[PDB]
């Protein structure tokens, strides 16, 4: 009688063991991706293009009469250019005159790979537009395709509807 | 995917019980999921119930204690509640929110489904056919469950509805004259019973084919509402996309109904009949009717909702509104329980409207229908004779009456009484039936054709 | 007379349903007693004692069927109706409360 | 909400204009040569409004003002009689009916208390059932028998009419309808049924000169 | 034509910039085009009741205003299709998507626009002629059974300016153009009619023509008339299938409409699976019932607006064909399911409840539903006539008759075909209760019966008297055992059994008894009642003294006659023609009278 | 008269159920009528049930389906619904809105009367002291009808209350040993019912003295609560201005009550019983009390407000509130109908509150009152005997009880049963009464004094 219970516990824990191992593979892959993105932000021209995009997308989502851009101190020269470009593009697209300032007193922690945060005039609304947040957001939304690519498709799934 | 950075708001207009009222929110959605961060670093989840312009109203899943109107931040996801589903999640145990509580990893999704889903297009619905045997004779040889029907277990409070539900999960399967799974959702379950389900499923080796959702009595009441939707959302994925048959057991729908009333009050809706929302009817149908067979696919979903009857009154809106939209009933009694009969299921008031199609040659055995009808009449007569005996005495009875009393006593002792760990297949249940029927001479078995008797009656 | 005259309540509803079940069981058990006496009576046809026993049992059965249960059913239906009437006045008051709250809120804006 | 019967004020007068135009169309359709002088006279009060361009609106005003015969019930009965006469001559279109018989049948209908429920109406409904069926019918023994028998039926109606009850026509109606309802799979029965007709017909060559 | 969403409080959506909107108009809310209706209006804002789930709807979403209120799309292609309660083709949704679900915000046109229909003009109309509402200007050839007549929409008239020539047209083309007071209207083959509006007729006529169902019971004793309204109980064991199939297969109506209101998924499947497999002989060919049927399918988890609207969608489709001159028979699978949907909406709108929790207007809605049935004189110059019958079922919770929905229905319908479960348990079909069932059209049909059959009326009167007496004698038999019982009562008891066994009972699974023509039904009853009278006279005229006739003498003496009477149901109308069956029944009548004659 | 031009508004504020709320209205008048046109040209009307400042609430009779907010055009007539009345309305058929539906012209008014009417000064109201001979023994004997009396028939769905009312219309005369103008309000009925009465009135040859108001089941439910007022307003013209004796029959008043209940719910008024307005009694009195003779004028109005009792519940608010207002009731039931007894009039729960003055010396026969009272005693006792005998059996009864069963059996078939065309006089009815009373010995006729028994009983 007790032998049956022992077999159940061994098989059930064995299933969890392999599932945890698969979750470690995903975790390690995401950590490697973060290191690869760190290598990207070490660039200059490619990173400035990312900043041009990130600032524009932040501004378009917040749509406030006044905005403050907060960034890592070492990235200020590049963000300055990104804001100067984002402003005339924003105004044309939205037809709203928004005063966009950069925060020169507070800066993002230097351990963040890169990206920006966008605050409204009273600093009560913030846009989580850093690179690490965007990567985590996309990695989860696209995760079903990661599963299949790495470990194979579900052989028992016949209808995708 | 959206690939749009999330907005986090620190603007709070006020907090009122379970609700947090936000301000200056950009294009909020109804039913949007948000996450709160309290000043102590504590995180909470919630869902937007009303969006009146920029005034979004969010119900917090956990308690609202500790939330202020100055520092608490609200992160919006930009989307609604969509459950990650996969085949691998079968064999896992989750809480009401869909999070693992079995020390395993988070589900690695194959897709994301809206838990509310859609109604199944009736043009592609297939009438129920084959049977799914439960292993419990009282509901295999008397009121079997067709492969596609929805038949509830009504019980009074205090009866062993949870022990039977667990037994069905351990024993249920196909007739076998690898493609069968059970999805079990317990709403409002107390800690002692929740442990019972988790441990009993793991120990007996059944977990490989069970997806278990536990929503505890002290868990958020809103999570109790999605719990049955998550269970069915998984069932729909497993059944219709992965070509397999799924048995879904929804335990304590009465506790769900109470959680639904709480949500209605949060919306300041005027209560309807007996305090319940006027839309309780469609809400139960929304859950119950996400089942059955579909054209062109080999999967199926069945349901066995289990409901506690308040004050043991079948008239109460909960069992009344349920039964009105389900196909028959199992009905667990109290007299059989007090007499120490397990399972305590009373065959006379029970009914399975689809049994006519569930059983018969090619699905169970040729004689299934005939044995059931004769046993039912014999039990009904035995009860009638027992009532007579109590008035006229034993000496006033004739031989035929004594045979019915012998059947009545041995029927309950051998056929209905089973034990929680004896698994009686459909063929053993019928053989037990014949052992009781061979008490009577052939001429008294009026409901069994002579051809059936000549084949099965002897030996 | 026409009703047992128990004040409408959920407690009274429960009692009447239990009382009705009891009356129905008594009717059936006495009917079976009568049927058993009738068979023995016809078989013999200590004879006059059976004719009196049948008339006495049938009279009691007839009263349950024609007097006592109808009265329980009328009482139960009365209780059910009165309970819905109480539910309605609660609904009415709650509706006006919700409307008054909405009116108060608009004035504050 | 004058709600005259089932119609409102505008609908009532619109239905009157429609029925008047319809009678004018039926009269020109049934008698394009204006040969049926007696029948036309019975409708002069509605035919006088024909052959004029009122763009609907001027005849509609005449109805509202009371210049047209705007009684809805009188028009309903009088219109039905004319279109039932059209069915009589239309359903036997392969054959010509004598003008004297057309007027005779007309007068018998006009005198009827309730033409819609008459045996005249039913007999025409059975005829149209039999003649509509044959409009799109495959070659086969059954359909050749029905087509041959229908041509005789149409020939006889053209000569006797419908109100003037005739045992010969009535018997042919029964045989045609009985064949029509007969199972398509059964061949021997429809063969014997047709042969019964051919041998029982009083003449020797029932179809000679009737069909090609 | 667009407004914007101002806010969502659940299933209720508040719109702004929606000044140009009418109450009970239609809107398509959000980017998924969710179906809903406008109920309350204030200023340029509107309160929208959304039928489907509102999850995901944002503030600022568009709202598209649709000028027409809830309406049914009427035109070619309606036949053979299965619709949602708000007129959404389920057979196209499941076939254009390859899905098993009804998509949220699904937008499939009620009638497909990719079919090239065969259209023939009336050939009587000319350009410049006058046409009015209800007039027929051409016929579409759909199938071998039902011609789909194209009528000018009601509330329209004028001079014809264009008539399409005969040819192949789809539902998006222009077939007729008419000008009224300088305003030109271009009409296709499809018309739209608000579902809550009653389609006008010229006049509403009395119903006098019987509804010729194939059952001996539910005809001889309890007649229904074309245009009449009846109710049928719907319980698991009542055997309602017999009426549904018998009515849809062999009825003398032209078009069958089956309306679900909000039943169990598996029950809707049973109807959808059975119907396509039903056939009937027509012109000697076996045709599918779906060529002259339309079906509306609604399960309990469908949007409540559809479950409530389903009943009116069905009857609107029914009236559409009524206006063609067809006789239409509509069955509502469960009017209790509809009443439940209606109560739910009243609850959502926080209306004060009335009797047993139902809306105060429950009775008014049911009364206006059934009033739409009846025999009518149609609109349009063709002077055609038609009718709509309703055979809606009732299934109150608990099986009681106290529920306002069943009580109100019984006060409205003129015929009640009360079914029972005990009869089904006894294997006696059709399962007709007899004592509860009634028909209030017996007087209306007396003119028909007198004109065509003459003896039917006294026979059905005697038959009910015999059956009622059989019930009345039940107490005497129980206390007696047919010993101390009059011989005349023995005739009543034993003959009543004969009636119950070999007349009122009918076995629809036998090829000879699939459909009993009326002339056969009255033939069978005539001989049984004639026997009854002969047996009563044989005993009564000889019961004085010395030499009397008893039932034991009659039964033993002429047992062959009782057998021949029982054998009468086996006269198969498919093989034995009207003359042969009548001839055989005449022979039994003569043999029967002579059998009694030999006793005197 | 009103010489100032009426104003037209496009200022609709909003629409809520059946109520259209206008703003910016100049000096709104309470209970004034507004005519409104929909964007498609449809014309509808309604009444202002509330005014406040510049706002007014209009209840639309035809309904609010299709009512716009921007294009809706409304005009205020400047007065209350005063309706045209003329003598030559007799022989015309109108709808529930007061418009002709017989293809005749509109009413060529002799005056305009306020549909709300005025209460008759009780000092000038003259007590009714004349009897109408209905020809029905069940009425003329035990529940006499006075001219000016209010007597509804309490009935139930399926019972021939329409035949009884029709019968009364033809054979209603006087006992003075006369052509009544009949106003028949057919509201909430099907076509066949309305056609039944219209055909019967023509069959009786009295159609030139009948004014019909029809509002059928498929007509608007709001017009159903002015139709009675339209009928009675015409009756008042005929009776009190033209000294014509008028009989006003209102068909199932329950359709009035249901139409009123719908309005009460729509306006969120205080309910009383079964959801009906707490003012239902006052509203019914406004309709019912438009009856009776007036001193100094030779006219009268007699009412027969027949009503259907929901579920045969004699305590339902409709028959209850009516019973409090009208001078008794005739009341039919199913126990008589189910035995093919016509008319199925049950005298026991019935009464006529004016009978005591309309019978006796100088009116009918001096023994009238005595015969009625004893028949009531004997009939009720016979019913009591059946209630006992159903349990105790015939053998438990004595000769004193069998007499009441003999009376009861002969009473129902001789006194109540008549037939649709059996017209008995009041004198014949009393003679029949005596024939039944002579079943008992003098000593048992305890409601009749010996000063009456000694004269009439011996015969």
Coordinates of N, CA and C in Angstrom, one line a residue, chain D residues 6-7 10-19 22 25 56 60 72, chain E residues 125 129-137 150-160 176 178 180 185 187 191 193 199-203 320 322-324 377-384:
Chain D
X6 N -57.0 47.2 -41.2 CA -55.6 47.1 -40.8 C -54.7 48.1 -41.4
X7 N -55.2 49.2 -42.0 CA -54.5 50.2 -42.7 C -54.7 51.5 -42.1
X10 N -52.9 56.8 -45.0 CA -52.1 56.8 -46.2 C -52.1 55.5 -46.8
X11 N -52.0 54.4 -46.0 CA -51.9 53.1 -46.6 C -53.2 52.7 -47.3
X12 N -54.4 53.1 -46.7 CA -55.7 52.8 -47.2 C -55.8 53.3 -48.7
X13 N -55.5 54.6 -48.9 CA -55.6 55.2 -50.2 C -54.5 54.7 -51.1
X14 N -53.4 54.3 -50.6 CA -52.4 53.7 -51.5 C -52.8 52.4 -52.0
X15 N -53.4 51.5 -51.1 CA -53.9 50.3 -51.6 C -55.0 50.4 -52.6
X16 N -55.9 51.4 -52.5 CA -56.9 51.7 -53.5 C -56.2 52.1 -54.8
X17 N -55.2 52.9 -54.8 CA -54.6 53.3 -56.1 C -54.0 52.0 -56.7
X18 N -53.3 51.2 -55.9 CA -52.8 49.9 -56.4 C -53.8 49.0 -57.1
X19 N -54.9 48.8 -56.4 CA -55.9 47.9 -56.9 C -56.5 48.4 -58.2
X22 N -54.0 47.8 -60.9 CA -53.9 46.4 -61.2 C -55.1 46.0 -62.1
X25 N -54.3 46.9 -65.5 CA -53.3 46.0 -66.1 C -53.9 44.6 -66.4
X56 N -49.0 58.4 -60.0 CA -49.5 58.0 -58.7 C -50.2 59.1 -57.9
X60 N -53.9 59.4 -56.5 CA -54.0 59.3 -55.0 C -54.8 60.4 -54.4
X72 N -62.7 50.1 -50.2 CA -61.7 49.1 -50.3 C -62.3 47.7 -50.5
Chain E
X125 N -46.1 43.9 -65.0 CA -45.8 45.3 -64.7 C -45.1 46.0 -65.9
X129 N -46.3 52.2 -64.7 CA -47.4 51.6 -64.0 C -47.4 52.0 -62.5
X130 N -48.6 51.8 -61.8 CA -48.7 52.1 -60.4 C -48.5 50.9 -59.5
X131 N -47.7 50.9 -58.5 CA -47.5 49.8 -57.6 C -47.6 50.3 -56.2
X132 N -48.2 49.5 -55.3 CA -48.4 49.8 -53.9 C -47.8 48.8 -53.0
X133 N -47.8 49.0 -51.7 CA -47.2 48.1 -50.8 C -47.8 46.8 -50.7
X134 N -47.0 45.7 -50.7 CA -47.4 44.4 -50.7 C -47.6 43.8 -52.1
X135 N -47.5 44.6 -53.1 CA -47.5 44.1 -54.5 C -46.3 43.2 -54.8
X136 N -46.5 42.2 -55.6 CA -45.5 41.3 -56.0 C -45.0 41.6 -57.4
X137 N -43.7 41.9 -57.6 CA -43.2 42.3 -58.9 C -42.3 41.2 -59.5
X150 N -41.1 38.2 -54.3 CA -40.5 39.5 -54.0 C -41.6 40.6 -53.9
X151 N -41.9 41.1 -52.7 CA -42.9 42.1 -52.5 C -42.3 43.5 -52.4
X152 N -43.1 44.5 -52.8 CA -42.7 45.8 -52.5 C -42.8 46.0 -51.0
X153 N -41.8 46.6 -50.3 CA -41.8 46.7 -48.9 C -43.0 47.5 -48.4
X154 N -43.6 47.2 -47.3 CA -44.7 48.0 -46.8 C -44.3 49.4 -46.5
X155 N -45.2 50.3 -46.5 CA -45.0 51.7 -46.3 C -44.1 52.3 -47.5
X156 N -44.4 51.8 -48.7 CA -43.7 52.3 -49.9 C -44.7 52.2 -51.0
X157 N -44.6 53.1 -52.0 CA -45.5 53.1 -53.1 C -45.0 54.1 -54.1
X158 N -45.5 54.1 -55.3 CA -45.2 55.1 -56.3 C -45.3 54.5 -57.7
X159 N -44.7 55.2 -58.7 CA -44.7 54.9 -60.1 C -43.4 54.1 -60.4
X160 N -43.5 53.0 -61.2 CA -42.4 52.2 -61.5 C -41.6 52.9 -62.6
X176 N -35.9 46.8 -58.8 CA -37.0 47.7 -59.1 C -36.7 49.1 -58.6
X178 N -38.7 52.9 -58.2 CA -39.9 53.6 -58.2 C -39.8 55.1 -57.7
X180 N -41.9 58.4 -56.1 CA -43.1 58.9 -55.5 C -42.8 60.4 -55.1
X185 N -36.6 55.8 -55.2 CA -36.2 54.7 -54.3 C -35.7 53.5 -55.0
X187 N -34.7 49.7 -54.9 CA -34.9 48.5 -54.1 C -34.2 47.3 -54.7
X191 N -35.6 43.3 -48.1 CA -36.2 44.4 -47.4 C -35.9 44.2 -45.9
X193 N -37.3 45.0 -41.9 CA -38.4 45.4 -41.2 C -38.2 45.3 -39.7
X199 N -46.3 43.6 -39.2 CA -46.4 43.8 -40.6 C -47.9 44.0 -40.9
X200 N -48.2 45.0 -41.7 CA -49.7 45.3 -41.9 C -50.3 44.3 -42.9
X201 N -51.6 44.1 -42.7 CA -52.4 43.3 -43.6 C -53.6 44.1 -44.0
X202 N -54.3 43.6 -45.1 CA -55.5 44.3 -45.5 C -56.6 44.1 -44.5
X203 N -56.8 42.9 -44.0 CA -57.8 42.6 -43.0 C -57.5 41.3 -42.3
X320 N -43.4 37.5 -42.8 CA -42.9 37.8 -44.1 C -43.5 36.8 -45.1
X322 N -46.2 34.9 -44.6 CA -47.6 35.1 -44.5 C -48.0 36.1 -45.6
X323 N -47.3 37.2 -45.8 CA -47.6 38.2 -46.8 C -47.5 37.7 -48.2
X324 N -46.9 36.5 -48.4 CA -46.7 35.9 -49.7 C -47.9 35.1 -50.1
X377 N -56.1 38.7 -44.8 CA -56.1 39.0 -46.2 C -54.9 39.9 -46.4
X378 N -54.0 39.5 -47.3 CA -52.7 40.1 -47.5 C -52.8 41.5 -48.2
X379 N -51.7 42.2 -48.1 CA -51.6 43.5 -48.8 C -51.2 43.2 -50.2
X380 N -51.5 44.2 -51.1 CA -51.1 44.1 -52.5 C -52.3 43.7 -53.3
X381 N -52.2 44.1 -54.6 CA -53.3 43.9 -55.5 C -53.6 42.4 -55.8
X382 N -52.6 41.5 -55.6 CA -52.9 40.1 -56.0 C -54.0 39.5 -55.2
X383 N -54.6 40.1 -54.2 CA -55.7 39.6 -53.4 C -55.5 38.2 -53.0
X384 N -54.3 37.9 -52.4 CA -54.0 36.6 -51.8 C -54.2 36.6 -50.4

